[PDB]
Amino acid sequence: GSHSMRYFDTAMSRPGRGEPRFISVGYVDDTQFVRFDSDAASPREEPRAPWIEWDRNTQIFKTNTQTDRCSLRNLRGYYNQSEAGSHTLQSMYGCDVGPDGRLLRGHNQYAYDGKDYIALNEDLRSWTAADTAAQITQRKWEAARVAEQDRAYLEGTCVEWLRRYLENGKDTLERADPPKTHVTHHPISDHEATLRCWALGFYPAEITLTWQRDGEDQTQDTELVETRPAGDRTFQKWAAVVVPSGEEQRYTCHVQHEGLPKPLTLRWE
């Protein structure tokens, strides 16, 4: 189906504890393929996905460390902030492609202290600035024609590498593993019981898991945990409903996932 390549970068100042830490992690869909950490004790043994086959590339991460440190200094000034506080700059960038490997869209956006700051628009030509601070960044990036450089990366390099990675890693990256499913039953009193619908061992993380009562969605009455990593590349999720004793067969569990040949409909037993 569709695929994404995305970098997730975090730069965090730590006054009195050295220069800001920079970490960059690259993903294809839900699979990490590269990491760079400016704090790494061994910068030579930093992890790579097994389907990766570089000095110039390490060099870009090292330059990006210095650039994010420049950014944090500028941001402190844009918000009139003291030298005493710790602050966080996050960035996300990369490309989405369809089943044919054609560009769907590009991304390049930033958050400061957990708030959206600036984003490259879907046109890959214009910026959306969240506030008067980000308007300074926007004017600087407009003056330097930065969007043209980001567009060239997102339409060219990013799409080309994602296509190469998907081919080289086709046995994993292009394999959807369906969820293994079961329903558990736990009385909570004489009057009520929990039905819990389990999905285990699935990849990618995207899944739909619901309870219905008499074929009506129980959105408000369903407890849905965040999808969570198992640590073997796969993900887990469950959904629970509290049901009156004896009414269990009115509830079904509905499971949608790319690895299933057909959506599942599960009842207790």
């Binding site: 970098y7 760079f36 110039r56 390490t58 330059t63 950014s71 990366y153 390099t157």
Partner: peptide, 9 residues
Amino acid sequence: AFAKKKYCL
């Protein structure tokens, strides 16, 4: 290459 050249904010 690995990653994108970044620009200072």
